[PDB]
Design a protein around this ligand. Structure first.
Ligand SMILES: NC(=[NH2+])c1ccc2[nH]c(-c3cccc(-c4ccccc4)c3[O-])nc2c1
Ligand SMILES: [Ca+2]
Ligand SMILES: [Cl-]
Length: 223
């Protein structure tokens, strides 16, 4: 997260770190046995780490669970990143409490101007690599579809939206992929891609979750 602030320990209780010996992507807990992340974060040997703040120190509240299976959207396109969403089933259910909690799926899509919270352990420099130990947060608005399409001509599908600042300075960055974009307490986006980090006129692009709720529900109901 570039230009964000320190969230504060466990203030984003649905945030998870996908780990394979190091943190490589974020995710969101949507119930006690399932996480939602980005399809391009897929790999084997994923350990989901819940209740984290400093990902390099065990401070208490952490729950480390292995993924039993990861379901990449069947229509995921790695060249366009269209349908960049993945569901992860946990080996055992997580113990939910005030520090580990799930976030709700939306009933409707959000409107441009809606302010959302983006969090993660990704890079905090636009020009360079600085990875934080604790969770960072950024409040950012969803942009209109015209500004998004005008920024990334030919690359935005109906399953994506832009959120961010066109002046630059604040944005999600590498290490944040797969994590949550929460607006009014509902998960509206998943960190997906962008051109650099916090560059002027190149906002971040997110996966539009409101378009996959029946898919998430039917898939979870059959697995
Ligand atoms: N500017 C942005 N809003 C942004 C957001 C998420 C990103 N994630 C990445 C990213 C960059 C290099 C590699 C990966 C990657 C590739 C495979 C697996 C996991 C991460 C990224 O997610 N760049 C990103 C840029
Ligand atoms: Ca920790
Ligand atoms: Cl277009």
């Amino acid at each position: 997260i570039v230009g964000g602030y320190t969230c504060g320990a466990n203030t984003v209780p649905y945030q998870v770190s996908l780990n394979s010996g190091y943190h490589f992507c974020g995710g969101s807990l949507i119930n006690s046995q399932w996480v939602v992340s980005a399809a391009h974060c897929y790999k084997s040997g994923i350990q989901v780490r819940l209740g984290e703040d400093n990902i390099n120190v065990v401070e208490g509240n952490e729950q480390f669970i292995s993924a039993s299976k990861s379901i990449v959207h069947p229509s995921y396109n790695s060249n366009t990143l269209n349908n960049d969403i993945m569901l992860i089933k946990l080996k055992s259910a997580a113990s939910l409490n005030s520090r580990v909690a799930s976030i709700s799926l939306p009933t409707s899509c959000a409107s441009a101007g809606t302010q959302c919270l983006i969090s993660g352990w990704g890079n905090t420099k636009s020009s360079g690599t600085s990875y934080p130990d604790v969770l960072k947060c950024l409040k950012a608005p969803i942009l209109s579809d015209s500004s998004c399409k005008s920024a990334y001509p030919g690359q935005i599908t109906s399953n994506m939206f832009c959120a961010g600042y066109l002046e630059g300075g604040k944005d999600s960055c590498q290490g944040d992929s797969g994590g949550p974009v929460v607006c009014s307490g509902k998960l509206q986006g998943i960190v997906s891609w962008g051109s650099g980090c916090a560059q002027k006129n190149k906002p971040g692009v997110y996966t539009k979750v409101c378009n996959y709720v029946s898919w998430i529900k039917q898939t979870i109901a059959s697995n």
